[PDB]
Design a protein around this ligand. Structure first.
Ligand SMILES: Nc1ncnc2c1ncn2[C@@H]1O[C@H](COP(=O)(O)OP(=O)(O)OP(=O)(O)O)[C@@H](O)[C@H]1O
Length: 74
């Protein structure tokens, strides 16, 4: 839980992923995965670390993602 990942909405604001989704993204990022799949809200997303984007695999919409360190000690 060393990171808080965020995604960018259409109006340009950043939203934190939930703790579990941040954990999933972070774990894949840490080991050098190129991409992972994430399901939330019944939607299927590819998290593409080569381009640092979240891609909706049905609509083709790509959104920026970014990582913030989590200060909180285990
Ligand atoms: N990781 C996420 N968690 C929650 N909401 C998200 C996430 N990514 C996108 N959204 C929101 O979900 C909606 C759909 O975004 P998404 O990128 O899935 O597809 P889209 O092609 O923009 O939209 P639509 O399905 O309406 O054509 C938008 O309101 C967007 O801000």
């Amino acid at each position: 839980d060393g990171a808080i990942w965020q995604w960018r909405d259409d109006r340009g604001l950043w939203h934190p992923y939930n703790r579990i989704d941040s954990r999933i993204i972070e774990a894949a990022h840490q080991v050098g995965e190129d991409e992972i799949s994430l399901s939330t809200l019944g939607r299927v997303y590819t998290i593409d670390f080569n381009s640092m984007q979240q891609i909706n695999e049905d609509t083709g919409t790509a959104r920026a993602i970014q990582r913030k360190p989590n200060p909180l000690a285990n």
